[PDB]
Every structure is written in C-alpha cells, then in structure tokens.
C-alpha cells in the first residue's frame, strides 16, 4: 500500500516503495525546518501508541 485514491486504497511494487522513500528523503533535504522535527517526534509517539 503506497497510495490513496477516491473509493479505496491502491497498491504497488518494490520499485514504487524505493522511489517514494528516495523522494521523501530528497524533499526532507530540500525543506528543512524545526517544525518538521517537532512534528516527527510527536507523530512518532502517537504512531507508537
């Protein structure tokens, strides 16, 4: 499960996953801010719960 569409969810393969992870890392590099790390920390806590 790698995407979302109206009326259900979508699926993909390993290549989509790796490309998505690389794009997420690149966008993390391009858009740094303290809000990002704060949101990441508390979102990690909520996700663990």
């Amino acid at each position: 499960p790698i995407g979302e569409s109206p009326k259900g969810v979508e699926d993909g393969s390993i290549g989509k996953v790796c490309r998505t992870l690389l794009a997420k890392s690149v966008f993390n590099s391009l858009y740094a801010s303290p809000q990002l790390e704060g949101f990441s920390a508390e979102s990690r806590k909520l996700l663990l719960v």
Binding site: S5, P6, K7
Partner: protein, 117 residues
C-alpha cells in the same frame, strides 16, 4: 498527448465508482469523442503531401509530350522526303513500314495525351 489522455481518463474513471453524477459521464464521453475526432484528423492531414507529390510528378510528362510531337512530325516529313527520291526496293519497303508504324504511334500518343488531362 495520448499518454495525457489515458492518464486523464484513468483518473476520471475513479471519481465515478465513488460518487454519482451524469455530468462526468457526459464529460468523459465528450473527451473520448474529441480524441477520436483528433486522431481521425491526424492521418487526414498527413495524407496531403502525397497529393502534391503526385501533382508535381504529373507535370513533367506534359512537357516531354510536346517535344515528342515535334520529333514525330520532323521525322515523318524527313522520312517522306527520303522516300520521294529512292531507287531501291529495299528502301521503299522499309519506308512503307516506317510511315505506317509512325502513323499508328502518333495516333496512340495523341489518344494517351487526351486521356492524361
């Protein structure tokens, strides 16, 4: 452009099985009709070059034909003159066949000239 069409139609297909509206149905039918019209017009505008190529190649025959008539009449008149002053049977027989053959050839060339236009 075709890839854009297929992406657009695939995206619009998923807003119908999660909602309800005849407007998007008519809209999708209208896009597919437009796509059919455009890719029909494609080969129609592609084929236009061959017509002009044929028209261009058809123009040279018109100007070789005039020279052919000139050659025909010149050789006819000179062959008749040569026939007039000969004193050998071989000569006369060959010239008889020559006149007959070129009369037939000139008739056929005129018929084709009339047909071509």
């Amino acid at each position: 452009t075709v890839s854009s069409f297929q992406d657009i139609l695939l995206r619009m297909s998923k807003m119908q099985l999660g909602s309800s509206s005849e407007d998007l149905n008519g809209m999708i039918t209208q896009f597919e009709s437009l796509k059919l019209y455009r890719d029909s017009l494609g080969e129609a505008v592609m084929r236009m070059g061959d017509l002009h190529s044929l028209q261009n190649r058809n123009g040279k025959w018109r100007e070789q034909l005039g020279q052919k008539f000139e050659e025909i009449r010149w050789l006819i008149e000179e062959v008749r003159h040569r026939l007039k002053t000969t004193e050998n049977s071989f000569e006369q027989i060959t010239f008889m066949q020559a006149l007959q053959l070129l009369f037939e050839v000139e008739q056929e060339i005129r018929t084709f000239s009339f047909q071509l236009i």
